[PDB]
Point group: C4
């Protein structure tokens, strides 16, 4: 009798059972940071991990039985699938980072609690309207990063030797973080006019962000 | 004597006298900071402090007789109690710290001047809307602080050794405080891809902030 | 005698004469910056400044014969008065800083050109709305300067050694300037809990400002 | 007959064709940034460029036939002209700052795509309303830059030795970047009241900026 399992997943106790579970693995993962805790009580913490990872895998499968193909247009579930799946690749071999990846699963507190999903809606939703302004700027970064690599990358490789470096550096300058005493004044000992580059650049990059914040605000 | 006391506390001179005294204690507390000045007046001051702390103690008692239970449903009045109270623990016995905490009674000039109560009130009133966006931020901070301890706490313990440290650093980075030349460039000498953590983090953190302001303005 | 002079001061020639003299002086003052120029043309422009100072003085006297009381209840005319008067104080010997206040006379470009006054006035108009907030800030900064000088002033005399210094260092923290790697991290080497003064202070100091601006928008 | 060419220029293939060319050269110019790529494909890109600068040149000529005297009244076309003109001067052997200036041609992506031109058009559009404020700021900066040179250039020539420098530092202090520990605290070692120049300065420049944004928002 299909509808019988299908009704369990939708219950208020199931989700909250899961919500109460994630909060537990999350607090677990916190204590997992304490080096003292991890070998004074480490086995319980390894155990909770396999249980919860199994239980969550069960929970996702049930919702798959229930939702069938309509599960794969729920971003939240797609997220849940990929985030639980992540926590399931075997540690042995491969990437130790995937082992760190597991904690992303703590974002399920977001996935399972309606206000957070609703908070994100305010967050995600101004983004599509910005992609155009994000397009102009990105282009600018791409153009200026290039000019910065050719003008300063020979003598200042750490900062500008490569395209990526001009980007990472320019972002920094864009965040305005220790940009003068830290990047331009040194440049200017070798290339006295480097300010004719950065000062306009900062302007454009500063100006755009400001007006971008404005168009967001009126709405 | 109920009405007789009631007419005292409510007079325009008692509060003005008490307010005047606050302005007086505040002038002395500033004065107390000079170690020269202390030698000449140290005792001289020491008593004005104990006089003012008593006069105020009288005040709190008088105001309580009039209101009984209605005194302790006034958030502004509770604060006055708690602020004068902790100034009652003796100059030792627990921590020389309480001795520094007592300066909080100058927040009484706020307490006693109505124009200020509205500004503070206007200020406090923005907060409840934020508590949803605030909570969400705390989760992201909690998740990333964990990944950060595991990723960077071994080679860079000052910055990421513990959740606390991972937190503190992240807050700093959140403030974009010397974040670039000062933290992420050093991380990258060891973990070249560390920019994949902070650059996305900085994005989320500055973005959510915008909308925290956006939602404030619009609402 | 009245109108003929009166027919002078409201005339487009008079003000414009005074305007072109500001701009010329604004240009002459740039030249005075180079030791090189001053070396071989210094006596040339030391005199030009003098004519203009006289001309501005004649100008202030005239507007007074014409206006009298009306003159000294006009803020833009009062500034001019004061910004001309200060420029009347002797350069070479005795007091040296007033010699530097002279270039303040380039602010006469603001008073004499109508689009500037309106923008300055629009700008000033914002101020009354925020004075309650501003008073609050100074009480708040003060309260904190006291706690700071006594908490940290001993091991970090430079940063908190004096009431005035703690105001200063705290003001820096509000600009978020090099605040963490630069101040709090160091403070924490000795006083691990110093983040309990500065992280809340930061949140609050950030909070109020944001609201002051939001207050401007709403106003 | 002149009519026959005119129908080619105006086609939907044409403008789309040029855009597509821009994106190739834009991808291609990222490739000129890698010396590695240059030891294999450099010969392809040194000429792929040259025919693009040829094709764009042919195209600019064409658009001049079709639009006549009205072409040099089109802001976007005028740019195309100059940004293409720059790209034609061969290789080295003059001022080779110009070889990198070639990349400004990737901004034709902006001129030729209508959403980008709007944002940009929208963005520039805020400028005319700022020009009164920019004028004021620059008069403020220029004034404070003069003063800094007379007060601080002797002992701190790197920073205030000359007007330009004084300008630069003041710009830096305005972006609030490592201003205290980086500039003013060192100043104060020799000239103790420098905080009185810089903190009011810091306020004003901060005051205007906040207030201009509010003006953007309401209008
Ligand atoms: C939210 C969890 O973060 C923490 O554990 C910390 C608290 C408790 O969290 C409070 C978070 N909030 C007040 C900022 N005090 C704050 C303030 C820290 C921090 O770096 O946050 C900016 C760290 C910390 C904890 C234990 C021992 C040392 C440290 Br150092
Ligand atoms: Ca810095
Ligand atoms: Ca900084």
């Amino acid at each position: 009798m299909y509808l019988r399992i299908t009704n369990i997943v939708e219950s208020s106790f199931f989700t909250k059972f899961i919500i109460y579970l994630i909060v537990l693995n999350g607090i677990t993962m916190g204590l997992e940071t304490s080096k003292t805790f991890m070998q004074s009580f480490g086995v319980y913490t390894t155990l909770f991990n396999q249980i919860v990872i199994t239980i969550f895998t069960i929970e996702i499968i049930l919702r798959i039985y229930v939702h069938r193909i309509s599960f794969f247009k729920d971003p939240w579930s797609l997220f849940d699938f990929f985030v639980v799946a992540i926590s399931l690749v075997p540690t042995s071999s491969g990437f130790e980072i995937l082992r760190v990846l597991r904690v992303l699963r703590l974002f399920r507190l977001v996935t399972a609690v309606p206000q957070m999903r609703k908070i994100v809606s305010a967050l995600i939703s101004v983004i599509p309207g910005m992609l155009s302004v994000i397009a102009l700027m990105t282009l600018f970064f791409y153009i200026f990063a290039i000019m910065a690599t050719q003008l300063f990358g020979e003598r200042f490789p750490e900062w500008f030797g490569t395209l990526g470096e001009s980007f990472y550096t320019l972002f920094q300058v864009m965040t305005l973080d220790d940009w003068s005493n830290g990047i331009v004044r040194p440049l200017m000992e070798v290339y006295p006019y480097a300010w004719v580059f950065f000062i306009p650049f900062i302007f454009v990059v500063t100006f755009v962000m400001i007006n971008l914040v404005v168009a967001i605000i009126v709405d």
